[PDB]
Amino acid sequence: NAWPAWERFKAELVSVDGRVIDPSDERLITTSEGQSYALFFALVGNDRQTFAQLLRWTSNNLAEGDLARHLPAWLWGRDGQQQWQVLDANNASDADLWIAYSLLEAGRLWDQPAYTQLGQHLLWRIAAQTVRKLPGLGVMLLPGDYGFEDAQGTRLNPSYLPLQLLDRFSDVDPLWGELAANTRRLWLASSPKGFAPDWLLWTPAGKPAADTKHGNAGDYDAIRVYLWVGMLAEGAAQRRELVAHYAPMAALTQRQGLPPEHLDARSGEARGHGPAGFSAALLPLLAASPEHVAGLAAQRQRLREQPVEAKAYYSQVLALFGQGFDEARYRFDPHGRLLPAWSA
Amino acid sequence: AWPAWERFKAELVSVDGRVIDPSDERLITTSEGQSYALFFALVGNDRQTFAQLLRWTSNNLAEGDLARHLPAWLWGRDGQQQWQVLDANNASDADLWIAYSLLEAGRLWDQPAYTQLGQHLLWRIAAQTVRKLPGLGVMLLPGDYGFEDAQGTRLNPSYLPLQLLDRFSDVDPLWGELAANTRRLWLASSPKGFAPDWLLWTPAGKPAADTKHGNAGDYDAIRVYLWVGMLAEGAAQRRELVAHYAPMAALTQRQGLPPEHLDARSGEARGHGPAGFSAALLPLLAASPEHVAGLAAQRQRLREQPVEAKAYYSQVLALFGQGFDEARYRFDPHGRLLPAWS
Question: Which residues does UniProt mark as catalytic (chain B) (predicted)?
Answer without folding.
Answer: 93 (nucleophile)
